[PDB]
Amino acid sequence: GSHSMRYFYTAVSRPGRGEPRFISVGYVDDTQFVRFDSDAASPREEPRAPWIEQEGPEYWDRNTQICKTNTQTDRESLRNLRGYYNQSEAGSHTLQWMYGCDVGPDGRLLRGYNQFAYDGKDYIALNEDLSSWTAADTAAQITQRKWEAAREAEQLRAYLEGTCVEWLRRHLENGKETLQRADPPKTHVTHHPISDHEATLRCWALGFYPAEITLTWQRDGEDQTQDTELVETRPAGDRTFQKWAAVVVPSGEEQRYTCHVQHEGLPKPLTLRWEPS
């Protein structure tokens, strides 16, 4: 269907505990494929998905270099940041960076991203037009004048519109078996009496890829959304995902309820109910 490639960078300062920590990962849709950790024996860009490892030595060395450089450029970033907010050098602070592209099935840009957060809140972000910036406060505006002088936005547009998209096409192609073979969810319904008079019905969905999924409960053909509890979609540990939906029902009326599952890897949406034994 539609796809995206994202990078996520975390830079954490650590007072009296040496240089800061840098951990960044790369994702094509919901599949991690690359990692970099500055505390590893000898820091380098690493493969975290099968498909990405046939790539030649240049790819790896090039990215290792870009990660190594970042360690220094964002060392000063955390320095400057702590300066803009008149913060003690004894505290620990966090700089996060995310950027990437969204391509429709057709493979053309839907929108590019380049955002930053300091200590947990939006700091500065490139807008959808890819030519303007949105600063969270007057400190970020300092950054905004620096990058506007450097014609930074003009540089990112070249990457997001060029490099990002092309490497996304390439990746979705190399591992098209892992990346565009949608895994249908294994579903079932469980029953759990809360009391004498009330029972919980749990609609399960396991082993599905990608993460996007819709689980809804109905009392007769009628939706029950804020009668339904949903858990956050969680990783199974093997690249597939899991999720469940529960509703508390009056005992004896269990069969008035049905569960409806929607997922990309399914021919047609499923409809389940509880099996009395």
Partner: peptide
Amino acid sequence: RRRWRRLTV
């Protein structure tokens, strides 16, 4: 590939 950003914040 990743994006090389020489600019600091």
